[PDB]
Amino acid sequence: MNYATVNDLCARYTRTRLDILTRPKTADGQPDDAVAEQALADASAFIDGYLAARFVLPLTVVPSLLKRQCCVVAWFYLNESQPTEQITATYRDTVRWLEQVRDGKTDPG
């Protein structure tokens, strides 16, 4: 329940690059921050599948580590029209990390 915001995404990737991703998904060709917010919500739902093995949800508080790891997944989601090896690799790293949190090998902060 969301672990990052559109502003967080902008801080990590820039609004320049976010807008480039959301522009082509619309009919009118303008940026659409609601598309990024949906990715962030979807990434948070995905993360909660792993967290729920060990933690009662919703959490208090969100470590800045989960914030980063929500932005990584959301960014992967937002690039699914033109994926890159680098973005895909960051995502797979974060999935492995989530599995480690689920399994008790590491902590979310």
Swiss-Prot record:
Main location: host cell
Compartments (UniProt record): Host cytoplasm
Summary of the knockout phenotype: Accumulation of unattached tails and full heads.
GO cellular component: host cell cytoplasm
Induction: Expressed in the late phase of the viral replicative cycle. Expression of late genes is activated by the viral late transcription activator C.
Keywords from the named record: Host cytoplasm, Late protein
Official protein name in the record: Gene product J
Organism: Escherichia phage Mu
Gene from which the chain derives: J
Portion held of the full protein: 1 to 109 of 141
